[PDB]
Design a protein around this ligand. Sequence first.
Ligand SMILES: O=C1N=NC(=O)c2cc(OCc3cccs3)ccc21
Lengths: 195, 198
Amino acid sequence: NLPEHWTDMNHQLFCMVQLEPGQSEYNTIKDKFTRTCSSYAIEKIERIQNAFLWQSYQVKKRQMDIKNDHKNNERLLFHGTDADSVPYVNQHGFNRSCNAVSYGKGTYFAVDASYSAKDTYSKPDSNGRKHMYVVRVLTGVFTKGRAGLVTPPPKNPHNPTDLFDSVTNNTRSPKLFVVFFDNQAYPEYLITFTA
Amino acid sequence: NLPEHWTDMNHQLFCMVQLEPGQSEYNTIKDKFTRTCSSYAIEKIERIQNAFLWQSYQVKKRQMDIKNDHKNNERLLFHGTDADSVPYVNQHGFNRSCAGKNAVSYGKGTYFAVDASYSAKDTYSKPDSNGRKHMYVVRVLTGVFTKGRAGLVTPPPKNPHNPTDLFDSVTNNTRSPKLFVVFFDNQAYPEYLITFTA
Ligand SMILES: O=C1N=NC(=O)c2cc(OCc3cccs3)ccc21
């Protein structure tokens, strides 16, 4: 059930598609980035077409929509990484088993591109190029995190296996989210940029 | 896609079903266990009906079946655990982030045994305060595997010049496998829970 806006993949299951500057899709993703990163230089934006990762993510989304008895479980967030991790993320997505982890041992995603644009996250490569993903994240119902969590806390410790979907730094005004399970995050676009 | 011989769960997403001795389904599990654990006695065997874990597992199996083309990717293995872990595994499956270091480590992941005798060690199936020991029978997507190494946090690449094309799992010995380690969520479906005693 591959999305309409994907382009044909000649019966293959993985491809990175470079977006055409000035078209609707490129403009929308560029705007999300330049909202906080207007001083950077965008080299290119690529659409990640990973059939298997999409499949696994959409199953978790359908499950969370049933569990939570509503949609609104999804947010678009940013994730900066080093060049040597980009092939892994494109093919396999995010892995908690692979920086500060103050809110738990999961994968971190930022509300603002400016945060992911820090050199500690989007490490500039031997040519000055920096890499940041635009990510579909199943944040669902969330609570404040804490150091040492390996899963989100329970919603009520009377039922210890019924968990929050994610954690955050601040529930009223979140700036980061942490997810603790594979296929809770789909890397949708890769931005290559310089300072 | 739920299997047609499961009990009707009446819109519920999760149920444990107590099996009857003398049914083929009970007897095959009892025989698989007693092949190496004849000194122990089974209290009960429960079929685990977890709709969401099943869906996510069967998606991964279909993907590995496509990618590997005509491999037997699935093995039926054992996993001993403590009573405190049983409610989490029943609902959420096998989480590598909660796994202990194994006495012989072939990587940082969830361990599954070929022989029930391995899982029956008190180190894994810790007796509870009533002397009950707990062991899962698990469908595991072992896929294409190689000998593991203690450093691993994912299976190793098949080819060092293509680091993202991975083995599906690792083992202690490729010629005579006795354990498998998996490093990803929804690569193992907890199918039965054996409760047993000395
Ligand atoms: O874009 C990111 N890429 N990798 C990260 O590890 C990461 C981590 C991150 O917040 C980590 C914390 C800050 C304060 C306390 S905990 C934010 C963004 C990213």
